[PDB]
């Protein structure tokens, strides 16, 4: 169904983003297999699967304590465990 | 499905459908219809993989005799401008 | 033909036949029959490509969760001993 | 046929079979196809798996000669 250790759960996505916005954050680190946003507050949930475990490990190397920090955003990224 | 589809051409005429899929590694290929000796319509898993496959492979020189042309109708469409 | 066939297993359960062919790049794949979630019987173009694919891919680590097993009945059979 | 990936072979020792020819060219790269056509020598044909593999064979030849300890193959590019 999915590739073990290549998936992420995302929190704290700015509410105005769509899936393309989330895609472009993760494409900076590797090839992206799938990407979705899941519309109370100013933030939404999301999911990203990288193309490979190596791609996902490149994301992991660029995180600051589980956070992907942009100029105007901080995504809280956790492994989809399996 | 329109956003899953791309056109690819320019590869060696000898390729079969499996060979065309190998050209698109590592993207997930779900269907290939050959349309000429050197052209095919390809269905990938979703619009993000189509978008990336066009970026990676359009204009890619396979060897001194073959250069890929890859296109689709997929447009990167962020809701807020990219940083 | 027996000498064109190999067995491959251990790749991710998610793969379709196009994904299995991508594993075997650059060899010419002419047929794939999946035999389980993570196993298939594959026909390559000829015995030399089967021989090389077994060498290249048997024991190959795809990632920390997947290792390929690849086998066939193809035996290198030079008529005179190699130098 | 992949353009620029194939070779015509001359001066193959007559005792060789296709496996003998294959192992000579496998030293330089991946081999797509290979065949011998059998008083002392025979002809053959080799297709490499890509142009880059065939170019690796070409980098290692002395004036169209592929030399071993006990053989000298005469190799030319097949053109269409």
Residue numbers in the entry:
A (entry chain B): 8 to 46, 50 to 92
B (entry chain D), C (entry chain C): 200 to 282
D (entry chain A): 9 to 46, 51 to 92
Please share text taken word for word from the publication where this structure appeared.
The PICS complex is composed of TOFU-6, PICS-1 (also names as PID-3), ERH-2 and two mutually exclusive factors, PID-1 and TOST-1. Complemented by biochemical and mutagenesis experiments, our structural biology data support that PICS is an octamer composed of two copies of each subunit, and unveil the assembly interface within PICS complex.
Given that the two structures are almost identical, the native one was used for structural analysis. For one half of the interface, Phe217A is buried in a hydrophobic pocket composed of Phe217B, Ala220B, V228B, and I231B. Altogether, both hydrophobic and electrostatic interactions contribute to the dimerization and the other half of the dimerization interface could be obtained via the symmetry. TOFU-6C primarily interacts with PICS-1A through α1-β2 of TOFU-6C, and α2 and a C-terminal fragment of PICS-1A. Specifically, Trp27, Phe30, His31, and Cys42 of TOFU-6C, make hydrophobic interactions with Lys246, Phe247, and Tyr250 of PICS-1A. In addition, α1 of TOFU-6C also interacts with the PICS-1(PID-3) C-terminus via electrostatic interactions. TOFU-6C also contacts with the other protomer of PICS-1(PID-3) (PICS-1B). Taken together, the localization of PICS-1(PID-3) in the cytosol depends on TOFU-6, and the TOFU-6/PICS-1 interaction is critical for both proteins to associate with perinuclear granules.
